[PDB]
Swiss-Prot record:
It comes from the Eukaryota. The PDZ 2 and 3 domains seem to be involved in the interaction with SLC26A3. Interaction with the C-terminus of CFTR could be mediated through independent binding of PDZ 1, 3 and 4 domains. Disruption of the gene was not associated with abnormal growth and development or redistribution of interacting proteins. However, a modulation of expression of selective ion channels in the kidney, as well as increased serum cholesterol levels were observed. Expressed in kidney, liver, small intestine. brain, lung, and testis (at protein level). Belongs to the NHER family. This is Na(+)/H(+) exchange regulatory cofactor NHE-RF3. Disulfide bonds: none annotated. It is found in: Membrane; Cell membrane. It comes from Mus musculus. Transmembrane segments: none annotated.
Length: 114
């Protein structure tokens, strides 16, 4: 059963990303992780790359990948999705402050749908 809810609590302002690359070519960025760190880590952001153009910064946490909550998923679960995603991949990056306030208020982040 799909019942409609009434009375939202709070909602953050996530940043959407639209990456575009050719078949065989690379995006420019890579999905990495850091010890004792929440969310996903993004390092190796080449210059003038199609990955950064999407406001992609270092350490940026990708709430969901291609429109899929990848918080509990494994580094392998994401990377793969990014591939099947297609020529164009979407990513949702949240601000540190916001994220922190979320992980602290146990606020469902997966819900965040830009």
């Amino acid at each position: 059963g799909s019942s409609g809810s009434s009375g939202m609590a709070s909602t953050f302002n996530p940043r959407e990303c639209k990456l575009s690359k050719q078949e065989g070519q690379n995006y420019g960025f890579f999905l990495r992780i850091e010890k004792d760190t929440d969310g996903h880590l993004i390092r190796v952001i080449e210059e003038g790359s199609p990955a950064e153009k999407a406001g992609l910064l270092d350490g940026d946490r990708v709430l969901r990948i291609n429109g899929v909550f990848v918080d509990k998923e494994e580094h392998a679960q994401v990377v793969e999705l990014v591939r099947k995603s297609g020529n164009s991949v979407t990513l949702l990056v949240l601000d540190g402050d916001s994220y922190e306030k979320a992980v602290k208020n146990q606020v469902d982040l997966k819900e965040l749908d830009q």
